[PDB]
């Protein structure tokens with residue numbers, strides 16, 4: 001059931017912003033590893049004396065990488081006179097975030113009908129304010145509230161990327177594309193699920209859609225999906241959620257799930273590049289798992305299509321309404337914290353409805369069971 | 377003339393260590409951009425709870441990328457019980473370096489006959505101690521003295537990479553190679569050249585080999601070359617050296633010159649990758665400059681060879697004894713601070729003697745003059 005209880009009008013995921021120590025090297029790594037094009041910049045060359053911000057795009061997916069310059073470059077500035085293109089940016093908050101957590105997501109940004117009203121309604125409904133609504137060039141409004149840990153939910157609304165950003169010139173934007181098209185969901189880890197759910201669901205009106213307890217929060221059309229995990233203690237293998245919290249110094253964003261229009265092509269392109277600057281993938285399931293695939297999704301995937309999943313290490317799950325293919329990268333940076341999921345959903349055609357096929361929770365049982373059989 | 381006045385026995389450049397915020401993303405970018413293989417690691421997987429260090433190699437060139445983990449992971453440790461593989465590492469110094477300067481070189485490491493004696497003699501001769509000699513696994517000795525700004529000169533000596541580092545497994549080490557073979561020289565920028573020269577020459581015994589004043593310090597066989605620049609003020613175009621100091625928050629390493637066994641192949645491979653994760657190059661000189669090449673180095677480079685320089689944007693200079701080909705990357709990171717030079721030297725065969733052909737100071741005049749002609 002879906003009560004459609006959003007307290008303000010939400011459209012779609014807009015962008016994800018990483019807070020980095022050096023935005024250049026992270027953006028170039030990600031661009032090559034994921035096949036995203038350099039689309040926009042705000043930095044010294046565009047008159048920004050405060051922060052370096054570089055935007056990568058693939059389809060509707062927008063990754064923003066931001067790092068601070070020396071505060072000395074903007075010491076004369078005040079907020080009314082700032083050359084920063086993102087008014088919420090603060091040297092101290094950025095350095096403190098990155099020092100405490102390492103490389104990771106600062107902002108999950110959603111496009112809303114009216115960022116000012118979204119901020120007002122959120123805070124009136126218990127959201128902790130982070131950056132008040134600011135109108136950029138009489139064209140765009142941006143506001144931020146706290147989401148979990150040091151991650152903010154960022155609202156952007158447009159009258160008609162951001163003012164102050166420049167479109168990068170052609171020689172600098174090579175048209176990489178491995179098939180990734182949009183952000184499917186963004187998942188946080190917290191020490192206690194209950195209070196985090198009540199806080200976020202409380203100010204948004206989003207409704208509810210081993211080693212972990214989890215629940216998914218969703219907007220009215222369920223195209224904005226924000227799962228949250230908590231650890232399950234006392235268990236045999238130490239909870240991966242608890243390991244995240246220890247190495248991240250507390251709550252934060254665990255994984256971004258990126259939808260591909262062709263997960264076979266995406267994974268072929270990404271795996272070709274894993275050892276030459278790209279991203280590594282988690283270990284593949286045993287051949288047991290892909291033998292059992294015929295019995296699970298035989299009417300969905302060809303024998304050749306299922307063999308392709310096994311070559312690429314793709315996981316497949318299925319619920320009442322649809323089928324999802326999925327795979328997970330190793331952590332994106334030094335710490336075992338944030339990672340990426342590549343996903344493609346089959347079914348639920350009306351457009352495809354958000355969340356079609358679930359989030360892969362059935363693959364816990366299939367993996368354990370397939371692992372048991374391989375040992376034989 | 378060469379007085380051969382080294383106060384201790386120096387062999388060769390050993391490695392360059394970058395202090396990063398995230399060593400993973402910088403190392404992967406550099407590996408792809410420069411064609412260096414992943415050779416060794418010290419991190420959580422090898423029992424290092426303190427820092428992540430990843431070593432890239434190309435020929436004899438060794439690039440080390442290091443970042444701190446959360447101090448919380450090693451809070452119980454003391455220096456006698458540390459799991460760090462580099463005993464000079466300190467969470468606070470690393471965070472402070474990176475926060476103040478951004479991505480850059482912390483250590484220029486040279487291999488010496490006896491790091492303990494090198495440290496003792498250096499400090500006895502005015503060097504500012506940074507990390508005392510420490511013997512690793514009864515096999516390697518490491519010590520550090522201050523060089524300029526927050527950059528240290530690191531001494532390593534071997535009895536027979538470092539203890540505590542693991543050789544990376546084969547699936548993780550793709551054998552990239554674009555022809556780079558060793559570090560030719562490493563250059564610092566300081567506000568005042570005189571006192572920096574007197575300090576470094578004072579404790580090493582190294583001898584002396586627009587917009588800047590510069591001088592090169594050299595070991596006995598002149599295979600360790602450490603130039604130092606200072607700005608020239610009052611001039612028309614603002615000094616690039618002064619711009620470095622402003623954006624770097626003071627003195628530090630300006631550029632690493634990497635010798636290639638085939639600069640044509642290196643530059644073809646690097647330029648192919650500039651816009652897909654690699655490094656960008658400075659703007660090429662006008663076709664004027666390459667027309668004048670025939671009159672300058674005609675007896676050295678074929679017409680086809682000189683046309684190849686023009687396709688790749690290679691600079692060529694020549695002194696009494698040899699010829700050098702050279703080109704400069706744009707800055708390696710967000711700030712206009714550190715960059716890389718690719719170099720190949722022709723001549724001075726006895727082996728090739730260090731510094732053959734100079735450092736390209738003649739190309740200032742040729743560029744200005746060639747620029748004047750292009751405007752015509």
Ligand SMILES: CCCOc1nc2c(C)c(C(=O)C3=C(O)CCCC3=O)ccc2n(C)c1=O
Nearest residue numbers: 185187214215227328341359360361363364367
């Ligand atoms: C071992 C089972 C399959 O392998 C894995 N699957 C994972 C999945 C399926 C997710 C995930 O995407 C997800 C949930 O699990 C529910 C909340 C919404 C959501 O996005 C996250 C991490 C996973 N890890 C680490 C695995 O090792």
Ligand SMILES: CCCOc1nc2c(C)c(C(=O)C3=C(O)CCCC3=O)ccc2n(C)c1=O
Nearest residue numbers: 561563590591603704717735736737739740743
């Ligand atoms: C404009 C003239 C050629 O273009 C350039 N040449 C450069 C050279 C030749 C060097 C350099 O390598 C060097 C010296 O100049 C003397 C001290 C030892 C040394 O290593 C450094 C920077 C340069 N930049 C920025 C240029 O734009």
Ligand SMILES: [Co+2]
Nearest residue numbers: 187257341359
């Ligand atoms: Co997921």
Ligand SMILES: [Co+2]
Nearest residue numbers: 563633717735
């Ligand atoms: Co040079």
